[PDB]
Design an enzyme around this catalytic site. Structure first.
Site, mmCIF file in Angstrom:
data_model
loop_
_atom_site.group_PDB
_atom_site.id
_atom_site.type_symbol
_atom_site.label_atom_id
_atom_site.label_comp_id
_atom_site.label_asym_id
_atom_site.label_seq_id
_atom_site.Cartn_x
_atom_site.Cartn_y
_atom_site.Cartn_z
ATOM 1 N N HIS A 35 0.826 -1.209 0.000
ATOM 2 C CA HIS A 35 0.000 0.000 0.000
ATOM 3 C C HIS A 35 0.854 1.251 0.000
ATOM 4 O O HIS A 35 2.048 1.188 0.275
ATOM 5 C CB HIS A 35 -0.965 0.022 1.188
ATOM 6 C CG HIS A 35 -0.314 0.324 2.497
ATOM 7 N ND1 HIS A 35 0.376 -0.621 3.220
ATOM 8 C CD2 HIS A 35 -0.269 1.464 3.227
ATOM 9 C CE1 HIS A 35 0.818 -0.082 4.344
ATOM 10 N NE2 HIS A 35 0.440 1.183 4.371
ATOM 11 N N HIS A 61 0.837 5.638 1.074
ATOM 12 C CA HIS A 61 0.218 6.778 1.751
ATOM 13 C C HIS A 61 0.723 8.041 1.073
ATOM 14 O O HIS A 61 1.941 8.217 0.881
ATOM 15 C CB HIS A 61 0.629 6.878 3.221
ATOM 16 C CG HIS A 61 0.030 5.837 4.107
ATOM 17 N ND1 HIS A 61 -1.151 6.032 4.794
ATOM 18 C CD2 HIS A 61 0.469 4.606 4.458
ATOM 19 C CE1 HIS A 61 -1.411 4.968 5.532
ATOM 20 N NE2 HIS A 61 -0.442 4.088 5.345
ATOM 21 N N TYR A 111 -15.908 26.417 16.319
ATOM 22 C CA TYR A 111 -15.657 27.735 15.755
ATOM 23 C C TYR A 111 -16.848 28.168 14.907
ATOM 24 O O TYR A 111 -17.298 29.311 14.996
ATOM 25 C CB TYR A 111 -14.378 27.726 14.912
ATOM 26 C CG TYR A 111 -14.016 29.072 14.346
ATOM 27 C CD1 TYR A 111 -14.197 29.352 12.996
ATOM 28 C CD2 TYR A 111 -13.485 30.065 15.160
ATOM 29 C CE1 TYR A 111 -13.855 30.593 12.464
ATOM 30 C CE2 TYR A 111 -13.138 31.321 14.641
ATOM 31 C CZ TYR A 111 -13.322 31.576 13.298
ATOM 32 O OH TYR A 111 -12.948 32.800 12.794
ATOM 33 N N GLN A 116 -20.337 31.302 15.780
ATOM 34 C CA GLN A 116 -20.314 32.480 14.911
ATOM 35 C C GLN A 116 -20.976 33.739 15.450
ATOM 36 O O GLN A 116 -20.504 34.839 15.181
ATOM 37 C CB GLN A 116 -20.893 32.173 13.526
ATOM 38 C CG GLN A 116 -19.892 31.574 12.558
ATOM 39 C CD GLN A 116 -18.601 32.380 12.459
ATOM 40 O OE1 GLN A 116 -18.620 33.588 12.223
ATOM 41 N NE2 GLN A 116 -17.474 31.713 12.657
HETATM 42 MN MN LIG Z 1 -17.230 34.305 10.467
#
Ligand SMILES: [Mn+2]
Ligand SMILES: [Mn+2]
Ligand SMILES: [Mn+2]
Lengths: 135, 129
Positions: free
Chosen positions: A67, A69, A130, A134
């Site tokens: 594999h 990454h 966050y 608002q």
């Molecule tokens: Mn904003």
DNA sequence: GAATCCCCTAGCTTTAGCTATGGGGAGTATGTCAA
DNA sequence: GAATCCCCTAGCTTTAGCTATGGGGAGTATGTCAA
């Protein structure tokens, strides 16, 4: 690399200001441990060529036998699938031309799947609160 | 914990913090206009199999945290959310139509995010080597 | 200048009003300034 | 079962071998088991 800042640095196309980093992972057909020796060195070179051509920035790339990454910085308008599709598809054609054992012992070099996970400098929960705060 | 989704060929978790603003940065995303904007986007997200993790407006711009199928494309969701909301909001609130040439602009802000921050993801790759 | 202003095409949805790793441009204008 | 195995169309790149918010399926066979 080990000291590369993870702080965001935005870029833009004609209409979008962005920073989209993707953690991409995919494996060879049947999960065969074919990404070793020369095949591995060439795979990374090829993907680097693809990246340069597609304006994709390889932030990190490590192969590990069955594999690979990649941590890529891609234009979201361009599409992470266009990069993946080209990196896998071209690497298949070329590696299978350059390494006969990959052409004869496998119907294809890769599978039809891949794992894609977006990443940013901040963790999801920080971004979520966050936005939540608002007002 | 990260719940990965998948279409027929891709296992994924693609979350984007998307932000855009009204034309001329007018502070029109308020009251009923704001409430409708959020409802319309929710509709679009349901129809487009897009998970809206978080979404808040702040008078002159809207923040959206959404999980979108990489193959489908984040720009397709954004095109649908802005285009449709513009059409519906402009029919519903005549002033958005009379005082502005368009509701939105041609630009937007997009940044990716995952459950794990970049340093951790780099550490995993580094460690698995 | 640009994401954001003005203008364009082509493709698609919302058949209007938005994208495109899409393009061209300047000057208080039908016109913004930053999340 | 699925992303991973088998099978399919059709769109684009590498003209072979990868995709598509793409579809169908089961059981040692061309055939995998998880980053
Ligand atoms: Mn904003
Ligand atoms: Mn432009
Ligand atoms: Mn399939």
């Amino acid at each position: 690399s080990a000291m590369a800042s993870n702080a965001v640095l935005y870029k833009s196309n004609h209409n979008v200001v962005y920073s989209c980093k993707y953690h991409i992972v995919w494996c060879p057909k049947y999960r065969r441990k074919v990404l070793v020796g020369a095949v591995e060195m060439r795979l990374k070179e090829i993907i680097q060529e693809v990246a340069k051509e597609l304006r994709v920035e390889i932030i990190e790339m490590q192969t590990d036998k069955d594999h690979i990454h990649i941590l890529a910085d891609i234009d979201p308008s361009f599409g992470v699938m266009k990069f993946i599709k080209t990196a896998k598809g071209r690497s298949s054609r070329i590696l299978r031309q350059e390494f006969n054992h990959l052409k004869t012992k496998l119907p294809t070099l890769w599978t039809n799947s891949c794992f894609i996970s977006t990443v940013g400098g901040a963790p999801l929960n920080v971004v979520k609160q966050y936005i939540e705060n608002q007002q």
